[PDB]
Structure 1
Amino acid sequence: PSGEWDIVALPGRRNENPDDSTYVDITYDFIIRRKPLFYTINLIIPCVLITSLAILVFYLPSDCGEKMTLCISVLLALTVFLLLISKIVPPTSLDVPLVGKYLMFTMVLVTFSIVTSVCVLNVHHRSPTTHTMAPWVKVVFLEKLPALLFMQQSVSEDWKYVAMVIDRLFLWIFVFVCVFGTIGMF
């Protein structure tokens, strides 16, 4: 027993080329199966463990100011895992490994997450003296509020409420798209 690899079947077939009439050879085919218990625990579990945190930066409150650290660190660790899985996978441009594709997809997703997070964090701190913009915002958000099943409710806290509403919406759509991102390879 070789350990990591298991042997399925070892057939051998003779090949003769009729047109040439001088080419004769024997081909043995080895169908080898990788035992995945080692690679699973060591690569897949940390991968899903860290990628489960993409949906997480949105639920953090914006006034704490710690979205950036967590999201940048997640993106950094994800790039590290991508480079590692690229180093261990054979450099074949013919086909793409499924794990690398999923990691690139969720990395672009985390970039979208960080840009919308900086947007909500910027709109969070606007004081009422600078960006008043009351009528265009009230009429739209007072009506948008019930459509999100959000709990019902000076202006400085109104801006915070705006930020909370918009980032909760981003989280609702974000978990939804991540569910399909997982289903794509279920």
Structure 2
Amino acid sequence: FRSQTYNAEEVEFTFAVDNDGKTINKIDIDTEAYTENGEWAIDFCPGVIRRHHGGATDGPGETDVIYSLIIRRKPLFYVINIIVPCVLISGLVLLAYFLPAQAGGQKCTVSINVLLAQTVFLFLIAQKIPETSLSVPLLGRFLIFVMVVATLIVMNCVIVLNVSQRMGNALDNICFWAALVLFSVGSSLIFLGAYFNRVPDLPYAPCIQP
């Protein structure tokens, strides 16, 4: 917030003072009527008054009030409708190894059809995520990792079938364990970053009192 017309030597801001005499240096929200948003929650809302000079030679002073809404996503919708389906779909890939390595076996069939389902999920996710390139989302990284791993399982099953149709069970077992360990560790590492990078503890008072 700033005055459009007047510089800092003409109009100056101060925060209002509550009936206790304490300055309300933050966004004010009334607990008894405020309805939370269906997607986001408000954690902190500090206000600061800033002063600078617009003229590089210390010309006329400028001033503004900046309020920092720290808001947090509610992930439940994405967990239920996106994350859990994608995780279980990607878990279905591992069952390709248990399937027989002989005619009638559908190892590659299952793997590629699961990848096609993951591609439909790719469409669904691409509908939601913004197109900015400053960073790659956790969900996008997980999706890409899943698709890569699925292609690797397809390659491994093709190799197993080529060897069988010329060790099949041993290769199937070792590749199954390798893929399971790799998938579990990769998914855990991808998701865990959101735990450490959750909304930090901050010196500000909470925006909504208990």
TM-score normalised by structure 2 residue count = 0.65
In structure 2, what is the equivalent of residue 65 of structure 1?
A: 105
Matches for 1:5-154 after TM superposition, within 5 Å:
5-18=40-53, 20=55, 21-63=60-102, 64-126=104-166
Aligned-pair distance for 1:10? 2.2
2:112–2:150 Cα contact (<8 Å) kept = no
In structure 2, what is the equivalent of residue 139 of structure 1?
A: none
Classify the secondary structure of the residue corresponding to 1:6: strand
Classify the secondary structure of the residue corresponding to 1:17: strand
Aligned-pair distance for 1:26? 1.7
Q: Structure 1: 5+ residue runs without aligned partners?
A: 127-161
Pick aligned residue for 2:171 from 166, 170, 180: 166
**Cα distance between partner residues in 1 of 2:110 and 2:41:** 42
Q: Which has the higher helix share?
A: 1
Range that drifts further, 10-19 or 73-82: 10-19
**Once superposed, what is the RMSD of the aligned Cα atoms?**
1.8
Aligned-pair distance for 1:19? 6.0
Aligned-pair distance for 1:93? 0.3
**Cα distance between partner residues in 2 of 1:101 and 1:182:** 10
Amino acid at match of 1:12: G
Q: Structure 2: 5+ residue runs without aligned partners?
A: 1-34, 193-210
Paired positions, count: 151
Deviations 1:91-134 (A, max 9, x none): 110011112111111211111110111121122223xxxxxxxx
1 or 2 for the larger relative contact order (CA 8 Å, sep ≥6)?
2
